Design a protein around this nucleic acid. Structure first.
Ligand SMILES: [Mg+2]
Ligand SMILES: [Mg+2]
Ligand SMILES: [Mg+2]
Ligand SMILES: [Mg+2]
Ligand SMILES: [Mg+2]
Ligand SMILES: [Mg+2]
Ligand SMILES: [Mg+2]
Ligand SMILES: [Mg+2]
Ligand SMILES: [Mg+2]
Ligand SMILES: [Mg+2]
Ligand SMILES: [Mg+2]
Ligand SMILES: [Mg+2]
Ligand SMILES: [Mg+2]
Ligand SMILES: [Mg+2]
Ligand SMILES: [Mg+2]
Ligand SMILES: [Mg+2]
Ligand SMILES: [Mg+2]
Ligand SMILES: [Mg+2]
Ligand SMILES: [Mg+2]
Ligand SMILES: [Zn+2]
Lengths: 140, 78, 80, 97, 129, 152
RNA sequence: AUAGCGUAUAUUAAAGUUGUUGCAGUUAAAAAGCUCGUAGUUGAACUUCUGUUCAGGUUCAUUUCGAUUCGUCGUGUGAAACUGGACAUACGUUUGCGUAAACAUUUUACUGUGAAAAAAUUAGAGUGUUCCAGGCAGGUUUUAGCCCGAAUACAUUAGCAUGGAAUAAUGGAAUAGGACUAAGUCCAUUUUAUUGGUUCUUGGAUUUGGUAAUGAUUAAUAGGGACAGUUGGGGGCAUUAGUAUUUAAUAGUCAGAGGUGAAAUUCUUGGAUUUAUUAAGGACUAACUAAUGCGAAAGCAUUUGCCAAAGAUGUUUUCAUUAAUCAAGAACGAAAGUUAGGGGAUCAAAGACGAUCAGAUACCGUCGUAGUCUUAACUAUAAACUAUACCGACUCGGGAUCGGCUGGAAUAAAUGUCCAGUCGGCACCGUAUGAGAAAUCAAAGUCUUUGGGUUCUGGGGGAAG
């Protein structure tokens, strides 16, 4: 039985069948139709943007805190994006309307941990790093 | 007019699934009036200079034979 | 103790005709003597429809389901 | 049609042998005398039956035939058969009188 | 619908070896089935076997001892160039140390080994170990 | 097994040919006499099969080919009495027509409509065979109206 | 980890979570409601089996030996699978010197060689770029030189050449001048330095004698067909019954009937409920009625008659691979619903009311329309359920059951009993040293010891049918 042809003239039906069923695999689907290119980064690794808002975001259950964040206007897209601002009092290194460098959170299009729905993090402020600034290597 | 079409059936091999696939090709051939050609006969044709848009082949030898049903469905790999 | 190659007769006789080694049939042929005109005829064991003796036209056998009914005083022997 | 069964016992059993012709195999398992399967370390139900040899005076000789049977065979209830036949081929059954 | 008589006879065989059975009635049979058996017998696995002529296809009784761990057919009967031998002996067989992959060749039906010694190949039939 | 009954169709009706190919010892008819009887029966408009039955029940002839060497139809062919349309197809069409007949009148009968579909299906399916094997004229088709006038 | 090391994103292994090898689909996502069927994929068995002898190697074994040596060689003897001769009704003629050709061998797939083939890459030999990445160089005082290298493999598909026995497909002589051979008749015809007649050859066609074993494999526990006694709640027409609900008539009798947890809406003196006898009108087939039957599924239960159809069994009947599964394309397909007519008794969505309740636009009660039934038509859907695809094998035991058949036995001698076989159905009960995550499963078994044939479906959850 096995519901699958075994025969030596069966070649195309086999391969076509796969060329079909392959679509149910998600990464294949998302890859094959442009999905990457339409996302707020336009397929890219990071993006530069402007800061519209500094915003607090109350954490998912069962955690309570205020996640410091920013809403950024991506310069390539002009799409609006909600991004997280890492470590401690780094929300202070940000002024409204700065240039800011933004990357994924490591789930490739999805939110991490207790921050609901927020898919991006802040990397650079003006030109400098949040790391450089935090450890106080450079000054803004 | 003085032209037929010929059909060559072959098995193309798909490496992965490790079996073959049934493909065919249609070659327009030129028939000299000196031949009696029944639909569904066996033709030998030599290469030729470009006679027309489609035709690069000319009929050399006809072999008579009987095909049952339509000529299309009949599959001979020789 | 059992050997497929030398199966036991009384067993094969019990088996269905297709499940024996030689796949042998159950039918016979019989010489039948008409009760009236005393003619001898040949009749298949499971014979279909009806048989009338050629001499006197009287009824010898009746059809069924694999049995033939030998009618009345008609005597028979199996041919083999 | 016995031939293969006889030829099977014709030569002795050997564990792994390297090119230096050592025996490498830690122990040589007993194999069942009917099915010819291997007798496990772990086999709960594998059995070795010893049966006595008899002189014309009814005397035991102290001589024994050992018939090994394996778990699957007893368990399927083939044992009572297997044994009898194993005793035929060794010439010990039926018992003469 | 019967396809591949070699497959019928081979599976029925393995089944009866596995059930500890002492012999197998095998039906129906072909050249190929008999050459395959002549091969397994020659190679030590089955014992003596007898062919029975019913006027049609045939029947075959096979004395088994027990040796066969498995004996299969591969369908479809693939194409096995000499290059591909490695694949098939690694994929099909229990170990390098034994077991055979039988093939049809224009030189006849062979242990894959007989094929290296005959230097040919190309059509896979089955295997036994 | 039984064609076009999926699920349970599967069983074995009998016939099993004996081993002895030689005709039986008690049988005294010359193969010629047999060919005579079979042709008489034939000209009377019987079927190769029906002829077979007659020879077997009445005449003590178990298998005609093991006597003659020629099967019944081949005999009919040589000796010229021939059943133009194969007995085989003949009956299938007779049937498909009896169903046509009954169905024109009872138009609400669904089972018989479906049975018809099945039988016609088999008819075409046999046509292909007898055509590729040259036993039927190449342009021959089964239609309602064509086959109704077709010797059935 | 380390002169590097975090992070983001695409992609690779992890992934047997894309599965040809190699996955899953009873309940985790998953078998299409059901049949027919074209493309596609898939296809039962049979043909120079075999034996005898010779040689060449190649392997093997070793109570044959040897020689030398740190293991090869020689040799035994037998034993193998070859390879190739040879004779056997037996892998071909015929000619020119082990090799060509021509003739003849139906074609191919497949396989072994070979040709044709781009370097750099990659694999890899040689070589101490101080190692190494790597480079293609190098090594030597015998120097107005010398020594040595710049390998080789791989180079998939398709073309090309050639060896092939199996396997697989296809072929050939069934209206046969088919084959061989002899004798004729035509149409061509190179050579005979040239044209003309005769001829010759040759190569096509054709007529007739003769020769030959003249030419048709079995007959699948494959399939189609015939036929014979049956079996069925399969279908379509007609017929026909039966109480029951509702209503009416004709008789009776009276004060209450209904309904509920209580009740109230209702019905009732114009006489209800109730009783007897009829009649009308639509439905519906109780009980027998079952782990029973039939039908493709949906579904099918009163009598009789008609019409076509069906399985299983029985065949020493006939055909002879006609078959399996199936995108296209088709026939069906509960209920509810829709269109146009009928019909309208029962129930009864909507609705009207009673009650209950905090609220009931609900469960309960009294009513009641569409519907329920029917002609013609649409519609295509269900937990359309064994949630379990179809054809085919093979793997345990036991009674029983429905339908055939085969013997046997008892009687009150038969369309009835019982007994023993067996073929096919629906199941059940044990049991598996078989399967599974388990529940469980005689298939859901014969699965990492992974390949009998074929369609379909699934790839975290929602979004969302
Ligand atoms: Mg994935
Ligand atoms: Mg990461
Ligand atoms: Mg959480
Ligand atoms: Mg630090
Ligand atoms: Mg069957
Ligand atoms: Mg569920
Ligand atoms: Mg075959
Ligand atoms: Mg010869
Ligand atoms: Mg009435
Ligand atoms: Mg009525
Ligand atoms: Mg019943
Ligand atoms: Mg209406
Ligand atoms: Mg109240
Ligand atoms: Mg009511
Ligand atoms: Mg009886
Ligand atoms: Mg599983
Ligand atoms: Mg277990
Ligand atoms: Mg059970
Ligand atoms: Mg599998
Ligand atoms: Zn008489």
């Amino acid at each position: 039985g096995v519901g699958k042809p075994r025969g030596i003239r069966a070649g195309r039906k086999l391969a076509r069948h796969r060329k079909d069923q392959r679509w149910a695999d998600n990464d294949f689907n998302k890859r094959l139709l442009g999905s990457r290119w339409r996302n707020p980064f336009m397929g890219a690794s990071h993006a530069k943007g402007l800061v519209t808002e500094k915003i607090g975001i109350e954490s998912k259950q069962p955690n309570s805190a205020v996640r410091k964040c920013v809403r950024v206007l991506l310069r390539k897209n002009s799409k609006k994006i909600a991004a997280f601002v890492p470590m401690d009092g780094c929300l202070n290194f940000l002024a409204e309307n700065d240039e800011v460098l933004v990357a994924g959170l490591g789930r490739q299009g999805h939110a991490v941990g207790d921050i609901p729905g927020v898919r991006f993090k802040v990397v650079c402020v003006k030109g400098i790093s949040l790391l450089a600034l935090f450890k106080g290597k450079k000054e803004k | 007019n003085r032209t037929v079409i010929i059909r060559r059936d072959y098995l193309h091999y798909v490496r992965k699934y490790n079996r073959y696939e049934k493909r065919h090709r249609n070659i327009p051939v030129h028939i000299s009036p000196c031949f009696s050609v029944k639909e569904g006969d066996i033709l030998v044709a030599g290469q030729c200079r470009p006679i027309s848009k489609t035709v690069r082949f000319n009929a050399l030898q006809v072999v008579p034979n009987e095909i049952i049903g339509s000529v299309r469905k009949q599959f001979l790999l020789f | 103790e059992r050997d497929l190659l030398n199966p036991i007769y009384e067993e094969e006789k019990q088996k269905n005709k297709f499940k024996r080694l030689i796949q042998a049939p159950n039918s016979y042929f019989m010489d039948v003597k008409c009760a009236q005109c005393q003619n001898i005829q040949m009749i298949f064991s499971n014979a279909q429809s009806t048989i009338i003796c050629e001499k006197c036209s009287a009824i010898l056998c009746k059809p069924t389901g694999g049995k033939v009914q030998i009618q009345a005083g008609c005597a028979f022997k199996i041919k083999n | 049609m016995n031939s293969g069964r006889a030829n099977q016992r014709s030569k002795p059993m050997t564990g792994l042998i390297n090119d230096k012709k050592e025996k490498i195999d830690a122990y040589l398992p007993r194999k069942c005398d009917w099915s010819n399967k291997l007798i496990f370390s772990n086999d709960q139900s594998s059995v070795q039956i010893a049966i006595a040899e008899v002189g014309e005076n009814g005397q035991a000789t102290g001589s024994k035939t050992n018939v090994v049977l394996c778990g699957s065979v007893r368990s399927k209830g083939e044992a009572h058969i297997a044994l009898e036949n194993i005793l035929r081929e060794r010439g010990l059954y039926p018992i003469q009188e | 619908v019967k396809v591949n008589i070699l497959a019928e006879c081979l599976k029925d065989l393995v089944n009866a070896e596995k059930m500890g059975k002492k012999q197998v009635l095998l039906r129906p049979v072909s050249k190929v089935v008999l050459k395959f058996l002549r091969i397994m017998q020659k190679n030590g696995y089955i014992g003596e076997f007898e062919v029975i002529d019913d006027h049609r296809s045939k029947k075959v009784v096979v004395e088994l001892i027990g040796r066969i761990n498995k004996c299969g057919v591969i369908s479809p009967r693939y194409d096995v160039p000499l290059a591909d031998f490695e694949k098939w002996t690694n994929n099909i067989l229990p170990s390098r140390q034994f077991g055979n992959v039988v093939l049809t060749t224009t030189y006849g039906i062979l242990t894959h080994e007989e094929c290296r010694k005959r230097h040919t190949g190309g059509k896979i039939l089955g295997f036994f170990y | 097994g039984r064609m076009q009954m999926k699920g349970k169709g599967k069983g074995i009706s009998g016939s099993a040919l004996p081993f002895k190919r030689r005709s039986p010892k008690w049988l005294h008819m010359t193969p010629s006499t047999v060919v005579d009887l079979s042709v008489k029966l034939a000209k009377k408009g019987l079927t190769p099969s029906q002829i077979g039955v007659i020879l077997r029940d009445q005449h003590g002839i178990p298998q005609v080919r093991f006597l003659t060497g020629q099967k019944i139809l081949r005999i009919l062919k040589k000796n010229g009495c021939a059943p133009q349309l194969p007995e085989d197809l003949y009956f299938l069409i007779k049937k498909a027509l009896s169903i046509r007949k009954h169905l024109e009148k009872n138009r609400k009968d669904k089972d018989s409509k479906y049975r018809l579909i099945l039988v016609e299906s088999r008819i075409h399916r046999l046509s292909r065979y007898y055509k590729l094997n040259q036993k039927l004229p190449p342009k021959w088709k089964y239609n309602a109206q064509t086959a109704s006038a077709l010797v059935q």
